[PDB]
Structures are given as C-alpha cells and as structure tokens.
Amino acid sequence: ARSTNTFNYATYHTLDEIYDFMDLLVAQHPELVSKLQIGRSYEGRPIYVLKFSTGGSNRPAIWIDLGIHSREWITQATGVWFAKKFTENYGQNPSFTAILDSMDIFLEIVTNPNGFAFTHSENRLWRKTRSVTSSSLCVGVDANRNWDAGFGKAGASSSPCSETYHGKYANSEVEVKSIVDFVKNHGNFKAFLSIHSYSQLLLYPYGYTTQSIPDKTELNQVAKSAVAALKSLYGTSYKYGSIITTIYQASGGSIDWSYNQGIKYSFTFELRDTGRYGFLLPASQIIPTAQETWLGVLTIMEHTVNN
Length: 307
Ligand SMILES: [Zn+2]
Description:
By secondary structure, this protein is α/β, with parallel strands linked by helices. It has a single domain, classed as Aminopeptidase, CATH 3.40.630. Helix content is 36%, strand content 16%. The chain contains nine helices and eight strands. β1 (33-40) and β2 (46-52) form a beta hairpin. α2 (73-89) crosses α9 (286-306) and α6 (216-234) runs antiparallel to α9 (286-306). The longest helix has 21 residues, at 286-306. 49% of the residues are buried. Bound molecules: zinc ion (ZN). Residues 69, 72, 196 line the site of zinc ion.
C-alpha cells in the first residue's frame, strides 16, 4: 500500500492496486524502472509496460507479458512479484546482475486491463477483451488468437460469441496492436515470453503449423533446462514442447508471431496448476508459483544473454 515492501504479494489485487504498485516501484527505483504507456485499452485504460534498464543505447531486450487472458489471475500476481524481484536481485544475484548490465527487460503485468477489471466487477472467469461491435451481442476477442501468425487458420474460432474468437482481422485488438508496434519499433527484442495459466507447460513455436522451427534443438534444450530449474524449488512438474504437438492447433498466438519476427527465444508458460483449482488458484500459492517460475524465466534469460 505505502511501499513495495508493504504491498501484500500473497493476495490477489485489483487493477487500481496494481497500477499504484507500478508507481511505488518507479518512485523507489527511479534509476532502474521506467513506466511506459504503449497504448490505451478498448475502454480507454492506460496500457503500461515497466522497463528495467541499467542504461545503454537500445540494448537487446527481453519481452514479458502476463494476463492477456484476464481470468488467469496467477499471471498478473506473478507479474507484480517479478517486478519487485528485479529490483531486489539487481546487485545481489550475480547472474541476474549480469543480465541487466547488458539487456533491458520490458514487463507487461496486465496485458488485458478491460478483461481484468471485468473479472473483478462481473465475471471472474472472463478471459477475452471487451471490444464490441458488429453483427453480434457478444463482446471481446481471444487476444491470444488475434496475432498475425496463421491468423484465422484452424485453432481459432470465427464466431464472435466464442471463447476463442480470433477477432475481425489480425491485430484488430488494440491491446495486441500496441505490443506489435512497440516491439516492431524497438527492433532489438531477443526473447519474448508470454505468461498464462494453467496446466504446467513450457511451449515454443508453432501452434498454427505442423512445420518444425529451425531452432527446435536449441529451443527444446532451453525448455528442458528451464523446466528442470523450475521444478527444483517445490517439485512442480512441467511438460514442454511445441504448442501444436503438446497441446493443440492454435492459430494467432503471441509466440508464433514473435518468432516469425526473428525473436528466437519465444516461449509461453502455462503456470499452476493441473486442474485441482484451475483459474481459481489459492492465494497461498501465489508466492511459491512466483518463486519457481522465476527460476524457469531466469534460465531462459541467461541463455539469451549467452547467445
Ligand atoms: Zn491464457
């Protein structure tokens, strides 16, 4: 509430608290953390990115987004925890410190603010955006099927009323296009991590196609390493692989896009749990989730700094 050291990371928060949090952090670490507004949501809400940087030019950067699907509360929660952790770990952990001395981190805690607010206000299990309009009474797009990455192919629905609606055209959703522009403009993203829940997976491209990425040996071994790292804290067991092989065909995803932009280290996480609680993961599992998922993320970041 009054500082980041006072903020309760062991409970779920509303939009206002998370935004206020972003302010506390910037005020507390002005030299390390910048808050960027890369857009406005459908309903006019600021869309915020925290930039972690130790200086430099347009340093190679890591993208991390969380909460694109609004009901996956664990992701927005982890996202706050990560932001704190960056500020804590800088100069303490030799490994993290070497990362930030050379690379920037862009962290998007609430990718889908409208959906988030709606999860608090009306429907806890809402996952889409809240864009309206057309020949429908149904609101919102699945923002993780809206990307220009086999957009409108099988693995996404052309019904507005669908929970997996892909939207009218690739990048129709402002929450998406804001990221696109942002990353395309920067031009020096080396890794790109989208954070989801649940089912305990680490995935690399493709979803939309059976085609094997050229970098699959490398991405596989990376995925292996990060899953090993993650399981070291509490024993939490992930599976890993390409989306289409592990999960299902899915078109218009985050990772397919970024990898097609030449960002090689394009990974999606699906956090806890395995179905016991689902989207409604107990607040008592926030910190343990955040802590292990850090070890998984750190691993990738390290690989990245290294190649
Ligand atoms: Zn999701």
